[PDB]
Each structure stands twice: as structure tokens, then as C-alpha cells.
């Protein structure tokens, strides 16, 4: 309070915006790797605005769905821009979030006191996967039918209530009009849960502030968010919109499959069923197990060892700048997630059955050889001392 | 009890409709082909597979190890004919037609 007024940004109507978006204290040495988080909140707003206008011309019926998407591309004013922004915009939303996650692994941003910020973001990554999968079915092409068949039948290897799971998810005995109608209703709903879980994920970071490239206690050198990290975030929103415009105007079909331009026929099978590029690493782990019930049970330990990183303790050094051995393991895990994506679009044959079984093992040896440096490393100040 | 009534009524409406269950059993016909080829015909929403395999196929077919099977059973019981094999065309693995 004071006795009379002052700057209007310090009034109750704009206090929550002032103290969290203008005057918020920030470490002064943050690099451009701290810019991909506001870039991911712009990619979520683009998908909501473009999809609300796409849904004014789409019909969720098996006799009318493929022809409603060609009606947008051909007869609606600017309608080809509305579709290409939405199909390619889901690839931009996954490039930005994948570079966000690998920042937090290099600088160990999951550590104390920031465990709830990590665990709220593993829930966000799960809501993004369900939303993109369920929305790839509405165009109703040959890859929108034979991809919803391969994934929803994978719940038929669960013990002995699982044959009642798949025919309740389907609404019948196969993928058909009962399945296309309920996949549309859930697809309008799940982006609005994703919005409320992103505002909650930001209230958990504004309780302790941000980490920095050195990993240290930083409260002695801090500046404000406006104008310093607003004008260098604006350099990032313009470099993004150039890169996004070479995918809409000059190459709008490079990141897709041609088989989704054939209308859906349940009598023949396509020769090769391959997902979008951003589902290729978990598709190669899922096909690496020669048992099917052990394939669903290798996807759930991917999201268990992610949710259980910030609860191992003894590591006082955070940043990989001062840690020369864990830094070399980071570049050796990134080479493995790019090799698991290559395997996930190859035939299931030799030699890709051995080269697709070792990288699922190397991927799970990253989360077990982290805590052993949490033991051998804490005896460094008693040995190297001078 | 009020939480019991509401949650069950929202989850049971997703199960299967009375018009989907009315199309679940019926009788349809096929045509002829020669020994060792393939043609399918539709029943409800999925195919009906097909084989009448040849005399070279009486070998490499049934006398392979019974203890090396994921589920061991004789060939003589899945067949009902000594050379024909035609049964509902959906793989038991993931619902794909192979």
C-alpha cells in the first residue's frame, strides 16, 4: 500500500502480471537455451486458434471425413493455409519441446528444489502424445486407419480384463464410425487440459526461480525480465517464424506420408506402416520385444524412469560444465535416441533386429548409471584437496 | 451410492450400442479358385482368409516340432479338410490383416 497512487503497474489489477512477467528477478547469464519455453507456449496457441477454424468445416463421419478435408483445401478462402499451418505446426511443437527437455538434462534442472517442475512436465509430455495421436485419425486415410488398429489392439495383451478394454475403447468389434466420433470429441477437450497444466507448471518455477549455466546460487547478480529477456526472446520468435514459413510455402508435404492421401480401405494393408517422425523412438522400443505383453511393459518404464530422476540424492554440482565424465555420457545418449528413430522406420528383419535391441538397453542404462556418480563423486573434495 | 450411479452411467455409454450388436451374426457365401491361391470375402466389418494348399505343402507344413510352438496343437484339428484352410482373416496379434 501507500497513501496515494504511484505507477499503475503496482496496482492490484495488474500485480500478478507485474511481479511475474515484468519485474521478475532473473539470473543475468541465461543463454539462448532458456528461450525454448516461451516458444513452446506460442506453438500451443497456434494449434488452438488454427484448429478452432478448421472445425467449422470438418465432418466426423466415415462417409464424409476425407471429403471435408479436400473441401477446405480447394473451396475455402485461404483454407490451404489453415491446414498446412496445423499439420506442420504439430511438428514445430515437438521440435521445440524436445530441445527444451535436453536443456534440463545437461544442466540438471530437475534437482532440488525443483522436483515438482520436472514431474509436472512429464505429465505434459503424456498429454501431448495422446492429443497428436487421436488427431491423426480425423483425416481418415490409409495411415489414419492402420495406425489406430496397430496401437489400440496392443491393449489386448493385458491379463484377463483386456479384450473388454479394447472393445470398450473401440465401441464395437473394429475401428469404425463409433471410434471416429469419440476421437473427435476428446480432441477438442485435451488441448484445454494442456493449457491448465502449463499455467500450473509455471507457478512451480516462480517459487524458486530459474537455474543458470553455471549451476550455482545466483541471488547476488539478478536483473529484471523486462526489457532484458523480452528483447532476446523476441529475436527467437522471429527466427522461428522464418523456419516455419519454409515448411508452409515451399515444402508442405515433406514431413508426412503419401499413404494418407488414399481413402481408408479395411480390406488391404499398406506395405509399410510407419508413424510420424516424432513417434519413431518409442515405436522402435515397442517392436524390439519379441513378446507383445512385454512391449507395453517397456513403454511404461520409459515414463517411470523419467518421473524418478529427481529423487536420487547425492550430487552437489549441477552443471555439466564442471563435470567432465557425465558430460560425455550426455552426448552418447543423444546419439542413441537418434539411432532409435532410424530403426523405427525400417523393416523388421536382419540386421535391424540386433541394432534395435542393444539401443533399448543403452537407453535404460542411462538412468541406472546416473546415481553411481552420486556416490563416487561425493568423495572428490577429500582426495583432490590442495 | 450417488457416486456409484453416476460414474457407471457415464462409463457404460461408451461400451457398444444396440445397433452394433444387432449386426454381429449372419450368413454369407464364397466362390471358387484353384489350389494355392488367395481371395477374400467380407462378413461383418473384417475379412475371411483363404488357402487350399498343394501336395508339396503337405510337407514343411505339419511335421515341424510341436514343442517349438508358442501354443502346441496338431494341424489336423485347425483343418476340417485335408487340403483346405479358410478361417476369419484377422491376425490374433494386433488386429491387422497380414
Amino acid at each position: 500500500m501507500r497513501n496515494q497512487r504511484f505507477s499503475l503497474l503496482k496496482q492490484p489489477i495488474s500485480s500478478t502480471l507485474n511481479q511475474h512477467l515484468i519485474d521478475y528477478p532473473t539470473p543475468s547469464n541465461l543463454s539462448y537455451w532458456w528461450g525454448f519455453g516461451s516458444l513452446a507456449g506460442i506453438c500451443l496457441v497456434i494449434q488452438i486458434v488454427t484448429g478452432v477454424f478448421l472445425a467449422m468445416h470438418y465432418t466426423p463421419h466415415v462417409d464424409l471425413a476425407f471429403n471435408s478435408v479436400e473441401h477446405v483445401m480447394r473451396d475455402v478462402e485461404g483454407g490451404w493455409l489453415l491446414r498446412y499451418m496445423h499439420a506442420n505446426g504439430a511438428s514445430m511443437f515437438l521440435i521445440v519441446v524436445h530441445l527444451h527437455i535436453f536443456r534440463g538434462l545437461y544442466h540438471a534442472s530437475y534437482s532440488s528444489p525443483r522436483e515438482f517442475v520436472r514431474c509436472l512436465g512429464v505429465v505434459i509430455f503424456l498429454l501431448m502424445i495422446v492429443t497428436a495421436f487421436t488427431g491423426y485419425v480425423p483425416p481418415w486415410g490409409q495411415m489414419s486407419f492402420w495406425g489406430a488398429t496397430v496401437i489400440t489392439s496392443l491393449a489386448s495383451a493385458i491379463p484377463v480384463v483386456g479384450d473388454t478394454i479394447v472393445t470398450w475403447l473401440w465401441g464395437g468389434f473394429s475401428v469404425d464410425n463409433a471410434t471416429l466420433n469419440r476421437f473427435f470429441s476428446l480432441h477438442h477437450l485435451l488441448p484445454f487440459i494442456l493449457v491448465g497444466a502449463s499455467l500450473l507448471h509455471l507457478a512451480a518455477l516462480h517459487q524458486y526461480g530459474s537455474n543458470n549455466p553455471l549451476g550455482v546460487h545466483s541471488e547476488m547478480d539478478q536483473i529484471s525480465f523486462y526489457p532484458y529477456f523480452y528483447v532476446k526472446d523476441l529475436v527467437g520468435w522471429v527466427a522461428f517464424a522464418i523456419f516455419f514459413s519454409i515448411w508452409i510455402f515451399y515444402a508442405p508435404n515433406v514431413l508426412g506420408h503419401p499413404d494418407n492421401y488414399i481413402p481408408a480401405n479395411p480390406m488391404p494393408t499398406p506395405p509399410h506402416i510407419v508413424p510420424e517422425w516424432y513417434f519413431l523412438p518409442i515405436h522402435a522400443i515397442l517392436r524390439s520385444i519379441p513378446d507383445k505383453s512385454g512391449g507395453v511393459a517397456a513403454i511404461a518404464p520409459v515414463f517411470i524412469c523419467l518421473l524418478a530422476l529427481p529423487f536420487f540424492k547425492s550430487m552437489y554440482v549441477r552443471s555439466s560444465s564442471f563435470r567432465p565424465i557425465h558430460q560425455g555420457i550426455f552426448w552418447l545418449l543423444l546419439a542413441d535416441r537418434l539411432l532409435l528413430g532410424w530403426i523405427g522406420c525400417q523393416p523388421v528383419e536382419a540386421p535391424f533386429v540386433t541394432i534395435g535391441q542393444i539401443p533399448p538397453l543403452v537407453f535404460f542404462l542411462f538412468f541406472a548409471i546416473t546415481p553411481i556418480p552420486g556416490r563416487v563423486g561425493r568423495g572428490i573434495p577429500n582426495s583432490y584437496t590442495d | 451410492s450417488l457416486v456409484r450411479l453416476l460414474i457407471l452411467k457415464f462409463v457404460l455409454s461408451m461400451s457398444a450400442s444396440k445397433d452394433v450388436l444387432a449386426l454381429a451374426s449372419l450368413e454369407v457365401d464364397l466362390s471358387s479358385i484353384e489350389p494355392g491361391t488367395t481371395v477374400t470375402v467380407k462378413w461383418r466389418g473384417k475379412p475371411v482368409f483363404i488357402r487350399r494348399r498343394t501336395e508339396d505343402d503337405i510337407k514343411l507344413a505339419n511335421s515341424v516340432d510341436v514343442g517349438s510352438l508358442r501354443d502346441p496343437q496338431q494341424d489336423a484339428e485347425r483343418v476340417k479338410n485335408p487340403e483346405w484352410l479358410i478361417v476369419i482373416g484377422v491376425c490374433t496379434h494386433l488386429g491387422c490383416i497380414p
Binding site: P159, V160, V161, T164 | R4, I7, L8
Partner: peptide, 29 residues
């Protein structure tokens, strides 16, 4: 004391089974 803490706490595991089949009758399993 501390035994009676768990000697209580494992019957809410079972108050929850009188409850877990109370509405759904999970049948096949």
C-alpha cells in the same frame, strides 16, 4: 504402537477391496 500403525494401515488396503469390487465387479481377473 508403530506395529499398530501398520496393523491398522493394511486393513484400509482391504476396506478398499470391499470397496474395489463394490461398484465395478472386475470380473475376469
Amino acid at each position: 504402537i508403530q506395529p499398530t500403525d501398520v496393523k491398522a494401515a493394511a486393513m484400509w488396503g482391504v476396506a478398499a477391496a470391499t470397496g474395489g469390487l463394490y461398484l465395478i465387479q472386475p470380473w475376469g481377473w
